[PDB]
């Protein structure tokens, strides 16, 4: 399907009766390559390892907003301890993750994820889903989140750039 199409908006994976379409945003090698990578995606890899990447990244990100816009912006006493706040959020966010994991049982008919790639290769399964898999992932997130939080505080609780 390249490249004298001279048009953009190919029907989704050749199927024009499934709702969605193909656009550069939907499917561009740059986007696709980008989307294929990352912890949420990257099937066939340990869930716990993925949660850590995702968890670690988010925890680190959360500190900035809480510290800067916190009720003590604005205070030595609350110089960044508010990061504790960022941490609390990941404690709560790990609950929400844990309870959601109870929508997947241990029987478990593992994986509600599709069983095939596009190109209809027809091969493989995902495994993020399922009770055991999801739980590992949360635990990674919790671990990743608390850490990302502490590290970001670390640098700030020293800093020098930018004051």
């Amino acid at each position: 399907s390249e490249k004298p199409t001279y048009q953009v908006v190919q029907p989704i994976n050749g199927d024009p009766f499934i709702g969605s379409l193909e656009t550069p945003v939907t499917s561009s090698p740059l986007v696709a390559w980008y989307l294929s990578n990352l912890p949420g995606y990257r099937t066939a890899v340990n869930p716990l390892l993925r949660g850590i990447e995702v968890g670690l990244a988010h925890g680190f990100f959360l500190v900035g907003p809480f510290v800067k816009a916190g009720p003590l912006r604005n205070t030595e006493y609350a110089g960044a301890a508010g990061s504790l706040a960022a941490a609390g959020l990941v404690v709560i966010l790990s609950i929400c993750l844990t309870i959601y994991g109870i929508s997947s049982f241990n029987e478990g008919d593992p994986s509600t994820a599709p069983s095939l790639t596009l190109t209809g290769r027809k091969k493989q399964p995902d495994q993020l889903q399922t009770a055991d898999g999801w739980a590992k992932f949360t635990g990674g997130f919790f671990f990743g989140g608390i850490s990302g939080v502490i590290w970001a505080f670390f640098l700030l609780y020293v800093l020098d750039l930018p004051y």
Binding site: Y6, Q7, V8, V9, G19, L21, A69, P71
Partner: protein
């Protein structure tokens, strides 16, 4: 139903009466003959023009016989513009109040007085003639419609020649219209007003026609007129620059735009519309086929594009009506925001009562017309959309990814709503808990609109730099250190933009986006939906498709206009509120001998309009005191209409919160009481239709709501300004 025979047939229920008016102008439902429709609407426009022409005649007539315009002319600073007088019956005469000039009348806000001074009108004699000339025209227009429907009605082929129509309308009407008015200015408006600004008095001004005949009187001022041959044919044009300039800004004595600029403006506009008039193809070769040019645009993204548009916009009125309504409304809005910032009339800006009501009037008219674009766009989809005969492809895709557009627009509104209204709920909570440092304010965490502040900055430094010919600024809100003060009133002043100004703009972003959402959702999903695959067969104006599927109420495109109608109210209603407070707080006021300026509310906008409680107290509760204390005075009617609107408004909630099933059952008991006493009408009483009850509801809601502010505003600025 007069229009249709079966419709006319006979009346058996009262529903027939309501239907009769509801589909009175629904011309495309009376015939399938396009030519018959087009002939109908063309004549209808004549009948319209007659009414507005008659309307104008009464405005000029009343200005002549029932106004103190002459009295206002000599002393415009503290004479109140008043037309129309009230007969002394059942206590009415109290509405006749002190307006100055030894005259008893109701103060007006239409702004005709400012228009008439700009036109150089000096006597009731002149107003009297213009009234008659308007009536004479009204007689023509009405007659013209009768002649083009019963005597000589144009062919469908006549109306379809859009090219020829375009060329004329933006040249024959726009160009020559601008040119013709440009002539009156420099020959009548400019000379006479020049005298008026010299305090010569109207009766001591020579008659307008004496300026035209002999150059002598017009040449002593503006000495470029002295040359009989004129430097025009010399094509130097530099000599003319005395009567017309690019000075801009504002005359410090009359508070309006220099007529010295408006004449030059129209002179440019005229030929600019005269040249642009020579574009489309007709008969003598030279020109464009709009059909051809439209076809040329196509794209990797659009595939075929615009192909077939010319067919659609030449066989479907609702398609053309939507486009026109969308921009004519949009044009009315930019008119409101150009006349406030650049006062084009003598002693207009000084008259605060007129300015508030002018800006507010144009905002509603503009707001309504845009909503009407949504209706006819949806009507087009239901009645005129046929892919078999008139495919576009542009329309396609749009329909193809319609679930996408709405879903995204749905998100933006939620993002905007939170990031607008939420900030206020934040400030309201932080202030209540006793922590103003926390709030989004200029004194605390500030959110400066640096982008808008930057655009204004470049407008200030524009004259001389990026605008050499411009001696002064475009508008004094972009001035910098300038200040015009006509009378003891402030005409205009640089308007500041702070964090309080950042919030309110984001509320307008919001309200407009939601209004767009509701209306656009109704147009795209007018034919089909996952819920209702055959909505197009139910029509454009239908109540529902039953309680099935969990409930399918207001799935019609009509009802989307119905819901978006309240939101357009919610929208403007807060634009006009922004205008009112900001102008009163940071612009309008009195200037002293030293130069100290005291504003009406005293700059409380910046730190009190960031709170909801602040609008409810410092704005509503405060500025209401006028309307609610207007009893026993000349502004008595506003106090009553304020109460009267609050009623027609709460009266709408009766129709909006209920359904016709209750009412029909109630009527049953009432019909019984009638049948007992032989007083049962043969025309059986029926409740309003499901859709009518919504139509009745929103009208009264808009009326009571709009009307209620009308009395709000007009009582406020008159008593204060």
């Amino acid at each position: 139903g007069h229009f249709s025979r079966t419709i006319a047939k006979g009346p058996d229920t009262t529903t027939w009466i309501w239907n009769l008016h509801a589909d009175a102008h629904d011309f495309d439902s009376h015939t399938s003959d396009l030519e018959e429709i087009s002939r109908k609407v063309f004549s209808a426009h004549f009948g319209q023009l007659s009414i507005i022409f008659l309307w104008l005649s009464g405005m000029y007539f009343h200005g002549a016989r029932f106004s103190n315009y002459e009295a206002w002319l000599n002393d415009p600073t503290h004479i109140r513009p008043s037309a129309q007088v009230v007969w002394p019956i059942v206590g009415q005469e109290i509405l006749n109040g002190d307006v100055g000039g030894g005259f008893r009348g109701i103060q007006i806000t239409s702004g005709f007085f400012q228009i008439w001074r700009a036109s150089g009108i000096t006597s009731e004699l002149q107003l009297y003639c213009t009234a008659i000339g308007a009536l004479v025209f009204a007689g023509l227009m009405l007659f013209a419609g009768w002649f083009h429907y019963h005597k000589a009605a144009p062919k469908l082929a006549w109306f379809q020649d859009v090219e020829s129509m375009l060329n004329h309308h933006l040249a024959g009407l726009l160009g020559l219209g601008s040119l013709s008015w440009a002539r009156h200015q420099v020959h009548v408006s400019l000379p006479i007003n020049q005298f008026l600004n010299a305090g010569v008095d109207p009766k001591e001004i020579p008659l307008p026609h004496e300026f035209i005949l002999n150059r002598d009187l017009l040449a002593q001022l503006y000495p470029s007129f002295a040359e009989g041959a004129t430097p025009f044919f010399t094509l130097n044009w530099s000599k003319y620059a005395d009567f017309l300039t690019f000075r801009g800004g504002l005359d410090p004595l009359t508070g309006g735009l220099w007529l010295t600029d408006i004449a030059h403006h129209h002179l440019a506009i005229a030929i600019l519309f005269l040249i642009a008039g020579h574009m489309y193809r007709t008969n003598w070769g030279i020109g464009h086929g709009i059909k051809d040019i439209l076809e040329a645009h196509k794209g990797p993204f659009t595939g075929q594009g615009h192909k077939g548009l010319y067919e659609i916009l030449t066989t479907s009125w609702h398609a053309q009506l939507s486009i026109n309504l969308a921009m004519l409304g949009s044009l009315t809005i930019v008119v409101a925001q150009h006349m406030y910032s650049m006062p084009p009339y003598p002693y207009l800006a000084t008259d605060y009562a007129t300015q508030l009501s002018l800006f507010t009037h144009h905002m509603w008219i503009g707001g309504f017309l845009i909503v009407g674009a949504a209706a006819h766009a949806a009507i087009f989809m239901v009645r005129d959309y046929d892919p078999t005969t008139r495919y576009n492809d542009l329309l396609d895709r749009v329909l193809r990814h319609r679930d996408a557009i709405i879903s995204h627009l749905n998100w933006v509104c939620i993002f905007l709503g939170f990031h607008s209204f939420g900030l206020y709920i934040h400030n309201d909570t932080m202030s209540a808990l006793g922590r103003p440092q926390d709030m989004f304010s200029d004194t605390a965490i500030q959110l400066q609109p640096v982008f808008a502040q930057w655009i204004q900055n470049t407008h200030a430094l524009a004259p001389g730099t990026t605008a050499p010919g411009a001696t002064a600024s475009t508008s004094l809100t972009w001035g910098g250190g300038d200040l015009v003060a006509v009378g003891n009133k402030v005409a205009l002043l640089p308007i500041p933009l702070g964090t309080a100004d950042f919030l309110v703009h984001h509320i307008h972003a919001f309200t407009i986006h939601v209004t767009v959402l509701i209306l656009l959702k109704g147009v795209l999903f007018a034919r089909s939906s996952r819920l209702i695959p055959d909505k197009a067969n139910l029509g454009f104006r239908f109540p529902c498709d039953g309680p099935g599927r969990g409930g399918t109420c207001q799935v019609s495109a009509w009802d989307h206009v119905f819901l978006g109608l309240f939101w357009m109210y919610n929208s403007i209603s807060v634009v006009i509120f922004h205008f009112s407070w900001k102008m009163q707080s940071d612009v309008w006021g009195s200037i002293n001998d030293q130069g100290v300026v005291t504003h009406i509310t005293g700059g409380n906008f910046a730190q009190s309009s960031i709170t909801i409680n602040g609008w409810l107290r410092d704005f509503l509760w405060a500025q209401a005191s006028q309307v609610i204390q207007s009893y026993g005075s000349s502004l008595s009617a506003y106090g009553l209409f304020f109460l009267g609107a609050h009623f027609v408004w709460a009266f709408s909630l009766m129709f909006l919160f209920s359904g016709r099933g209750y009412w029909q059952e109630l009527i049953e008991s009432i019909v019984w009481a009638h049948n007992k006493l032989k007083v049962a009408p043969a025309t059986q009483p029926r409740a309003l239709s499901i859709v009518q009850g919504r139509a009745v509801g929103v009208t009264h809601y808009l009326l009571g709501g709009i009307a209620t502010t009308w009395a709000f505003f007009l009582a406020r600025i008159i008593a204060v300004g």
